[PDB]
Amino acid sequence: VRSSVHARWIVGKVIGTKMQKTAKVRVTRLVLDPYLLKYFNKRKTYFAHDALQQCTVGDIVLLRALPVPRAKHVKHELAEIVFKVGKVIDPVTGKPCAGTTYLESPLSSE
Amino acid sequence: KKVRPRLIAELARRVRALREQLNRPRDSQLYAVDYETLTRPFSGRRLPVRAWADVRRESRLLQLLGRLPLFGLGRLVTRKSWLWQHDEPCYWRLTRVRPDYTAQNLDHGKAWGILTFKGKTESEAREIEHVMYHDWRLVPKHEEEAFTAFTPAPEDSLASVPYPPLLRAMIIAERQKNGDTSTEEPMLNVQRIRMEPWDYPAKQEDKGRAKGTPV
Amino acid sequence: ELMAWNQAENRRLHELRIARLRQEEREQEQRQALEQARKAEEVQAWAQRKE
Amino acid sequence: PMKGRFPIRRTLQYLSQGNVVFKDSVKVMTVNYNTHGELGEGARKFVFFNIPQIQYKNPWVQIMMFKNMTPSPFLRFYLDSGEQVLVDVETKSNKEIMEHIRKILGKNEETLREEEEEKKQLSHPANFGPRKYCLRECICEVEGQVPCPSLVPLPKEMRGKYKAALKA
Amino acid sequence: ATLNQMHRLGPPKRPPRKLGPTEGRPQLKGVVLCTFTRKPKKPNSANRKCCRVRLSTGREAVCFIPGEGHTLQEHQIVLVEGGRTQDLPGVKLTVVRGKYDCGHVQKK
Amino acid sequence: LYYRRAHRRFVTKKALCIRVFQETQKLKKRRRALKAAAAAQKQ
RNA sequence: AUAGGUUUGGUCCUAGCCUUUCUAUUAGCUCUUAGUAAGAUUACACAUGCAAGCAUCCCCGUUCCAGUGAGUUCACCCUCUAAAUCACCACGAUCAAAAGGGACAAGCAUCAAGCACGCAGCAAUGCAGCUCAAAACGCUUAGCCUAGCCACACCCCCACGGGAAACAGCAGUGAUUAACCUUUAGCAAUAAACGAAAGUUUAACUAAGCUAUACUAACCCCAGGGUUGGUCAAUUUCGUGCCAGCCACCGCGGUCACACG
RNA sequence: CCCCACUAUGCUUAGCCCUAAACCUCAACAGUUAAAUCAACAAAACUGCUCGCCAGAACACUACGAGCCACAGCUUAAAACUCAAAG
RNA sequence: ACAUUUAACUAAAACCCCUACGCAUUUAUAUAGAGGAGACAAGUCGUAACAUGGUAAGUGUACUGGAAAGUGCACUUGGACGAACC
Numbered sequence A: 001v002r003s004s005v006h007a008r009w010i011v012g013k014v015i016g017t018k019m020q021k022t023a024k025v026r027v028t029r030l031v032l033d034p035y036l037l038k039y040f041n042k043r044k045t046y047f048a049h050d051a052l053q054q055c056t057v058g059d060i061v062l063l064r065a066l067p068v069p070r071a072k073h074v075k076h077e078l079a080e081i082v083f084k085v086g087k088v089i090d091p092v093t094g095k096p097c098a099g100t101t102y103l104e105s106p107l108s109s110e
Numbered sequence B: 001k002k003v004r005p006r007l008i009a010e011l012a013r014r015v016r017a018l019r020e021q022l023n024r025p026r027d028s029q030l031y032a033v034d035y036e037t038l039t040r041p042f043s044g045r046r047l048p049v050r051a052w053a054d055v056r057r058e059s060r061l062l063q064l065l066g067r068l069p070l071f072g073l074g075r076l077v078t079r080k081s082w083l084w085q086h087d088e089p090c091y092w093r094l095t096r097v098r099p100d101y102t103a104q105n106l107d108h109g110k111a112w113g114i115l116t117f118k119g120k121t122e123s124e125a126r127e128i129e130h131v132m133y134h135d136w137r138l139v140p141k142h143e144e145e146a147f148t149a150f151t152p153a154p155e156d157s158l159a160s161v162p163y164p165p166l167l168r169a170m171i172i173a174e175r176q177k178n179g180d181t182s183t184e185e186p187m188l189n190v191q192r193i194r195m196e197p198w199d200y201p202a203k204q205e206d207k208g209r210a211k212g213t214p215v
Numbered sequence C: 001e002l003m004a005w006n007q008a009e010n011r012r013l014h015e016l017r018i019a020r021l022r023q024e025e026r027e028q029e030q031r032q033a034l035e036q037a038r039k040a041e042e043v044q045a046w047a048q049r050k051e
Numbered sequence D: 001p002m003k004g005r006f007p008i009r010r011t012l013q014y015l016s017q018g019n020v021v022f023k024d025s026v027k028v029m030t031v032n033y034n035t036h037g038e039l040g041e042g043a044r045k046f047v048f049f050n051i052p053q054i055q056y057k058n059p060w061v062q063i064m065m066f067k068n069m070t071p072s073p074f075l076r077f078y079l080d081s082g083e084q085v086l087v088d089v090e091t092k093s094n095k096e097i098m099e100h101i102r103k104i105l106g107k108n109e110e111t112l113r114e115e116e117e118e119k120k121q122l123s124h125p126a127n128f129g130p131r132k133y134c135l136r137e138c139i140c141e142v143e144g145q146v147p148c149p150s151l152v153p154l155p156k157e158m159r160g161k162y163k164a165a166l167k168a
Numbered sequence E: 001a002t003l004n005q006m007h008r009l010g011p012p013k014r015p016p017r018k019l020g021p022t023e024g025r026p027q028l029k030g031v032v033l034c035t036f037t038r039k040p041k042k043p044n045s046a047n048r049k050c051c052r053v054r055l056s057t058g059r060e061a062v063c064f065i066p067g068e069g070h071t072l073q074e075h076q077i078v079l080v081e082g083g084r085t086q087d088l089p090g091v092k093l094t095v096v097r098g099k100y101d102c103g104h105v106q107k108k
Numbered sequence F: 001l002y003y004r005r006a007h008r009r010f011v012t013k014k015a016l017c018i019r020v021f022q023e024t025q026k027l028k029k030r031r032r033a034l035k036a037a038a039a040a041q042k043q
Numbered sequence G: 001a002u003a004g005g006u007u008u009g010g011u012c013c014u015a016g017c018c019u020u021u022c023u024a025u026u027a028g029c030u031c032u033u034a035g036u037a038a039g040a041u042u043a044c045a046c047a048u049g050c051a052a053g054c055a056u057c058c059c060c061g062u063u064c065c066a067g068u069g070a071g072u073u074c075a076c077c078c079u080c081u082a083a084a085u086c087a088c089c090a091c092g093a094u095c096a097a098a099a100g101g102g103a104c105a106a107g108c109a110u111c112a113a114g115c116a117c118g119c120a121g122c123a124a125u126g127c128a129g130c131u132c133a134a135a136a137c138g139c140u141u142a143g144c145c146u147a148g149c150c151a152c153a154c155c156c157c158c159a160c161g162g163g164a165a166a167c168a169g170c171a172g173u174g175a176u177u178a179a180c181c182u183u184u185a186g187c188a189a190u191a192a193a194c195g196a197a198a199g200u201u202u203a204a205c206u207a208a209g210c211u212a213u214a215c216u217a218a219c220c221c222c223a224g225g226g227u228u229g230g231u232c233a234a235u236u237u238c239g240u241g242c243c244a245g246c247c248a249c250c251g252c253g254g255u256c257a258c259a260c261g
Numbered sequence H: 001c002c003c004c005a006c007u008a009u010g011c012u013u014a015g016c017c018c019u020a021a022a023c024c025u026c027a028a029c030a031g032u033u034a035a036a037u038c039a040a041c042a043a044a045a046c047u048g049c050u051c052g053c054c055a056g057a058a059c060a061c062u063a064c065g066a067g068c069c070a071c072a073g074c075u076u077a078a079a080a081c082u083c084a085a086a087g
Numbered sequence I: 001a002c003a004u005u006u007a008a009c010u011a012a013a014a015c016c017c018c019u020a021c022g023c024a025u026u027u028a029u030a031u032a033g034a035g036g037a038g039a040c041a042a043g044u045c046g047u048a049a050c051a052u053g054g055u056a057a058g059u060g061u062a063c064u065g066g067a068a069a070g071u072g073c074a075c076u077u078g079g080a081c082g083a084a085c086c
């Protein structure tokens, strides 16, 4: 629960899987433009330890901070795959969906 | 953000630390004194005016131990300053003595003993301080028993001291504010506090040492 | 306590979804029944022309 | 004029009117909303109007938005313990969503009042110092006290130029 | 520009301010090299007395000597100031009357 | 990820930078065996 | 900005430049007193004097204060844990390094690629990756976000070692610059060092000296400087004659000049 | 400038070159005709959204750098001095 | 590169290396000489542009000429064609 890594929980998009057991994840935060007072995305890349090499490019993942950094740039681990690329399960209904259409009707299992 | 490594700052640091251990100034060099001018030649600093008389007329601890067979191991050594100040017997029971071989007369070095101050004996032996002072005296064997013969005085002392005016008023006011009604006056407990004399031997293990720069 | 209330709110909303989805299928089935009828006539009419 | 539709959203006054100050547990807020469909209108308005207010009050919370990934809009909060709070927002108005998340994950009005009182104690009326930090710079400002020599020349007897001349 | 475009460019990059003939300094010390006159541009006509000085910076520049009558010679010390002489194109320095060798104009 | 011309000066420098790396790898490994051999001799 | 002058034969539009406001240095001319504040142009070279001692010897201190702005994303937050203070083993608290994470100047993209800058494994070793137009890598500029902080302490980022012989401590001098404070006094106040202490030391500091740079208050006798075509408050008569000169902008002066003396 | 003659060239095949008043000088997409319609002229006035581009004239379709089958080339593209206008 | 201890009736002594760097590399000032741009009351030759400017103008490109410029090819209107039938 006590870790030296500043970012404890961050969600991001997996953008690279060329390193062994390391997923390169793009994390975007909304930052206020002081002059325009409009929020613009600012993106930062995080290396996440993926022991099982289950991450595919384009999937949304949840990263948990490691207690201490395991490498120079590897400070996080893959806690969860929130949305698998092209294989999303609707969290509200629990059914497989393809974009905005249900692949299996929510009424099948009542 | 990548700091450019400074490698000469670490090299010199190690070299300095080493030279301070190899070219260290020995006890003979540091604590030598010129009795004609009463100045330490190594540092070239004059001794205090109040210390001049004692330096001329007194001997160092190991100056007395230099003439003893085993450097006065297990021999009681008092100090003139203690004899003058305190009536109660104050002495170090020597346990270990490491003499300086570089000294021609073996008159410098370090000593460890058990301190008995004002008739109170410490439980454990610790390093003796001010070993280089010209203040020590050797207790003769025939006189050792009589010198150490002391009767414990009554320890009765004041345990409670009145709070200072403003503090007391605030404490009492707080009682009444919280609803406590007590006629007793708040009193500090000084029994835990023990005021040692200013000349009580301090710890020689945490004391520093003069550096190597010779004059 | 608030997490249990949130989960209860999500379950209530799920029941309303199931009701809404059931009605939409009924309407879907009807529209799909009429499209199939129209399509079948078009295919038959076109098949006759090619024959 | 100011650019964009509803330019009011880009004003510090509007950005400070958000009433949702998340508890310290909340770390990440994900907003999954659909760009079309009447059942998702509230989520679209909540993204349009309220995310700027939420982010302004919670600068260190990561807000990430995903378009047209699921048939229905929903919010998910990732708490520091690891708990995930899924809030379904379909059919709800943007005001209802804003009030729902305030109840379940927003600091109550009492907690916020207390924090503001702790800030008050940082500045002490009696402390003398520069105007940025203190009300008064010198005691000479207090009426009755000897005034500053810059404004009122001190008596000659209180000036060291003549405390020495009189003595010698 | 759009709000996205304005964010990407950022605030206007203030065009860097140009240092004039004195190099952002009120006055410069100079040594007189030669004294000549220059004909003004249209529609004016005159023989405006000027001099060429080597400034303490090392640059050599033409400086207008104001007033009626100057006694400046070569290898003399003058203090120059800014202020262009509208008549003479490219004369952007003026000799200060009353400092070092350059004396005050003699009354009438 | 990036759309930029790979002109001649870049193609040549990138080819050399890969060769220099490949050579540095080999020399770093030849300074592994020599160090191992000397350590083995002491024993 | 409450705006103003200025493009043309004239109008409207656009546009730059400039005027009017408030400061800070320097120059000219000029100046009476009092209080207070502030006070080399240059990290250029420095004569002389002083600026750290205390104390019954050991220690402690001289690693602070004071000074400078050369370099420059070490200053802030989180984690972690030294030294240090709470008389001492505690104790936790306070304070705060190293280390880990995050954040954090300006201009230039005619600086567009960097060239080893990644990951895995106990290791062996394997894999070929890593940063970058959301500005990597570079160049240039600058002390900063001022209850103050950061950095430097003659130079080689460092300082074992070399160059070499050091005022960026106070006062002072040379050179240099448009840039110009005394080679005063005292430890009485506060701060620091040391002592168990009475006390000792301190160019920190305090009280003075110098200077219209600024503020405040006076002043019986004592006022100067700039300006006077328009913008913009305010010119009489002569002299001069596109000459001599003036001008922030527009412009004036070739014999009747409110513009020059 | 007018007349006559004739060549490169206009054509074919195979590679280059990469420019134009390449301008309908009016960007793509989605709407609107009610208010203030609206400096002038031109081809009525506007809204949403996005990308590209522009900040006095001239220097300058220029210098230097970089890239390019281009080698008297094209693309990108400044500054110093000058002016109080240019338009 | 390199070095492995003495001493021990209490506990101590001993410890100390060498390689860089110059007409290398980076940026900038100076220029024999060779040219540009701007400024500049009254110089010379022609008359290219502004009117159908007396061959309408201009863009790209090519060749050509003391000099503005000329001509070929395509393109533009930021020219015109007199706006019922004669």
Ligand SMILES: NC(=O)c1ccc[n+]([C@@H]2O[C@H](COP(=O)([O-])OP(=O)(O)OC[C@H]3O[C@@H](n4cnc5c(N)ncnc54)[C@H](O)[C@@H]3O)[C@@H](O)[C@H]2O)c1
Pocket: F001, F002, F003, F004, F005, G133
């Ligand atoms: N230059 C890149 O490699 C790159 C990488 C990621 C995204 N982009 C995208 O390019 C745009 C901004 O580019 P810029 O203005 O910095 O470039 P720019 O105009 O400075 O062009 C420099 C380089 O960028 C390339 N480039 C230009 N426009 C591009 C575009 N739309 N997409 C990709 N490459 C482009 C050019 O080919 C050239 O190599 C945005 O759409 C941005 O998301 C460009």
Ligand SMILES: [K+]
Pocket: E043, E044, E045, G242
């Ligand atoms: K004139």
Ligand SMILES: [K+]
Pocket: none
């Ligand atoms: K204007």
Ligand SMILES: [K+]
Pocket: none
């Ligand atoms: K003055």
Ligand SMILES: [K+]
Pocket: G054, G055, G060, G194
């Ligand atoms: K001491």
Ligand SMILES: [K+]
Pocket: G069, G143
């Ligand atoms: K600096």
Ligand SMILES: [K+]
Pocket: none
């Ligand atoms: K240094």
Ligand SMILES: [K+]
Pocket: G187
């Ligand atoms: K004092």
Ligand SMILES: [K+]
Pocket: H023, I076
């Ligand atoms: K056209």
Ligand SMILES: [K+]
Pocket: none
């Ligand atoms: K012509």
Ligand SMILES: [K+]
Pocket: I056, I057, I079
């Ligand atoms: K024409």
Ligand SMILES: [Mg+2]
Pocket: none
């Ligand atoms: Mg500690």
Ligand SMILES: [Mg+2]
Pocket: none
């Ligand atoms: Mg630190």
Ligand SMILES: [Mg+2]
Pocket: none
């Ligand atoms: Mg670009």
Ligand SMILES: [Mg+2]
Pocket: G142
């Ligand atoms: Mg600097």
Ligand SMILES: [Mg+2]
Pocket: none
């Ligand atoms: Mg140094």
